[PDB]
Design a protein around this motif. Structure first.
Motif, PDB file in Angstrom:
ATOM      1  N   UNK A   1       5.388   7.095   0.941  1.00  0.00           N
ATOM      2  CA  UNK A   1       5.936   5.662   1.516  1.00  0.00           C
ATOM      3  C   UNK A   1       5.052   4.701   0.715  1.00  0.00           C
ATOM      4  N   UNK A   2       5.724   3.650   0.269  1.00  0.00           N
ATOM      5  CA  UNK A   2       5.067   2.429  -0.133  1.00  0.00           C
ATOM      6  C   UNK A   2       5.577   1.231   0.704  1.00  0.00           C
ATOM      7  N   UNK A   3       4.647   0.432   1.271  1.00  0.00           N
ATOM      8  CA  UNK A   3       4.985  -0.916   1.956  1.00  0.00           C
ATOM      9  C   UNK A   3       4.631  -1.944   1.227  1.00  0.00           C
ATOM     10  N   UNK A   4       5.401  -2.889   0.957  1.00  0.00           N
ATOM     11  CA  UNK A   4       5.563  -4.255   0.270  1.00  0.00           C
ATOM     12  C   UNK A   4       5.773  -5.319   1.463  1.00  0.00           C
TER      13      UNK A   4
ATOM     14  N   UNK B   1       9.457  -1.109   3.355  1.00  0.00           N
ATOM     15  CA  UNK B   1       9.190  -0.076   2.700  1.00  0.00           C
ATOM     16  C   UNK B   1      10.134   0.941   1.984  1.00  0.00           C
ATOM     17  N   UNK B   2       9.875   1.826   1.053  1.00  0.00           N
ATOM     18  CA  UNK B   2      10.320   2.983   0.535  1.00  0.00           C
ATOM     19  C   UNK B   2       9.756   4.007   0.743  1.00  0.00           C
TER      20      UNK B   2
ATOM     21  N   UNK C   1       0.951  -1.157   0.224  1.00  0.00           N
ATOM     22  CA  UNK C   1      -0.026  -0.085  -0.024  1.00  0.00           C
ATOM     23  C   UNK C   1       0.716   1.289   0.134  1.00  0.00           C
ATOM     24  N   UNK C   2       0.341   2.407  -0.198  1.00  0.00           N
ATOM     25  CA  UNK C   2       0.768   3.532  -0.290  1.00  0.00           C
ATOM     26  C   UNK C   2       0.103   4.696   0.576  1.00  0.00           C
TER      27      UNK C   2
END
Ligand SMILES: O=C(CCCC[C@@H]1SC[C@@H]2NC(=O)N[C@@H]21)Nc1cccc(S)c1
Ligand SMILES: O=C(CCCC[C@@H]1SC[C@@H]2NC(=O)N[C@@H]21)Nc1cccc(S)c1
Ligand SMILES: O=C(CCCC[C@@H]1SC[C@@H]2NC(=O)N[C@@H]21)Nc1cccc(S)c1
Ligand SMILES: O=C(CCCC[C@@H]1SC[C@@H]2NC(=O)N[C@@H]21)Nc1cccc(S)c1
Lengths: 125, 125, 125, 125
Positions: D81-84, D99-100, D66-67
């Protein structure tokens, strides 16, 4: 002799204009210096790393990695970058990499300690 | 003497049960061996890296990084991992890290060449 | 209206030949479809994400991110990629990104669950 | 109904004390809000993402991502931020993520645009 000892050893330049000079040893060692065109850096910094001295013969690249701690006689940026990537030989030789830059932080700021990016290195800029 | 030369030098264990044995030199060098509890690995592998031998005195951790190329006398996984992180001293000493594992690939598979993760190292498992 | 609502909305192509089609909403929403030129993928996949609808006016890019879960009517690769990056307007408009691809794994394989890379998106391939 | 629609939907907390509240849709949608315990953030921020609504039945986790764009009515941190990661059910349910976080930057500072880290989410803190 490492398969790509000769291919890897030498001077490389990335998209930022940084200079990486490395010697590859017959049994997987990488030694050299790094000079960053950006950031809290001046002149050359020691680097060390490792590479696969017997890569697959199937056209795959050659895995390698190295570290710079951003301390030298001129500056200390309290940080270290590691580059992880693969060397690809041939007329368009290139070292393609992703990197992690970690700063020393307090525990409170540790969540923001680490940058990620990607550098591509060529023999001519 | 590096500020954390003594703190860093020794045997560390991560959450996977891997063993990292390292010597920190007075001027920022890291040498040692790594034994992975997981993956395409057996026994010890050479590692080298760097650390900040004069960290901030403000309670920040100590930046460091190292590489393993996954070739030794037993196996060659055509890959290299780099760990980037910081050492934190004190009763709960710990090396907190993020890492990149790159395989040698064909150009067609290069988009999937690199794993990312995080390892936390402790003095006792 | 988001500052870059118009700039972002549309069709983008990356270096692999993938196609990203997105609509940016006035209040930060991103909806669209993604078609991958590589990997365990066929046809279009839903994506959603967010962007900064009021970026700095100092020449900085526009932060954004989105996700694709790799399940559609044709395939299920039990994985999800997130792209995190920034949109840059102008004659050479580009969305520069880093991404994380996580597969569903057993706990034993979780250390190798996540790929990292970088995609650059352009308006013309 | 997505296999883990029920398992995922709800309130999650990470190691920093952040709160993630999400609704998972039958066909892979994730909507919700995120409140960060750290950084340039206050109150809740919209999030959207995707998950694998038909995971492997072999004990693997469930891929998702998600973002959050860090703009709401109180603040704008010009970042996203994006969490994968993957959701794991059972008595110790957990969403494990990397995350990034990308900021909007000038082109000159783009090399330092992106943080990487890892968050683990639990149902009880
Ligand atoms: O600035 C430095 C030292 C120089 C980094 C050079 C980077 S290494 C990856 C990339 N590739 C290059 O060739 N140059 C760049 N550390 C530091 C400390 C605290 C916060 C921040 S943001 C940065
Ligand atoms: O398996 C290996 C060699 C052993 C990796 C050990 C990793 S290093 C980061 C982490 N931390 C540890 O302590 N152990 C794990 N390479 C390889 C090649 C092609 C595809 C794949 S998926 C993997
Ligand atoms: O292959 C897939 C589905 C398609 C991924 C497409 C990637 S997304 C980032 C990049 N950017 C693009 O445009 N294409 C590529 N998942 C998967 C599952 C298990 C192991 C592995 S290695 C891969
Ligand atoms: O501070 C923000 C906004 C809040 C980020 C929250 C992070 S998201 C991943 C992690 N997981 C959590 O729960 N909290 C943290 N952006 C920003 C802009 C420019 C430079 C920097 S360093 C940071």
């Amino acid at each position: 002799m490492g398969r790509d000892q000769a291919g890897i050893t030498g001077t490389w330049y990335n998209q930022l204009g940084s200079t990486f000079i490395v010697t590859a040893g017959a049994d997987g060692a990488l030694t050299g210096t790094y000079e960053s065109a950006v950031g809290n850096a001046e002149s050359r910094y020691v680097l060390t790393g490792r590479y696969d001295s017997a890569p697959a013969t199937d056209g795959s690249g050659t895995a390698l990695g190295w570290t710079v701690a951003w301390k030298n006689n001129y500056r200390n940026a309290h940080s270290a970058t590691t580059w992880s990537g693969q060397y690809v030989g041939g007329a368009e030789a290139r070292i393609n990499t992703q990197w992690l830059l970690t700063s020393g932080t307090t525990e409170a700021n540790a969540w923001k300690s680490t940058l990620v990016g990607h550098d591509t290195f060529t023999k001519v800029k």
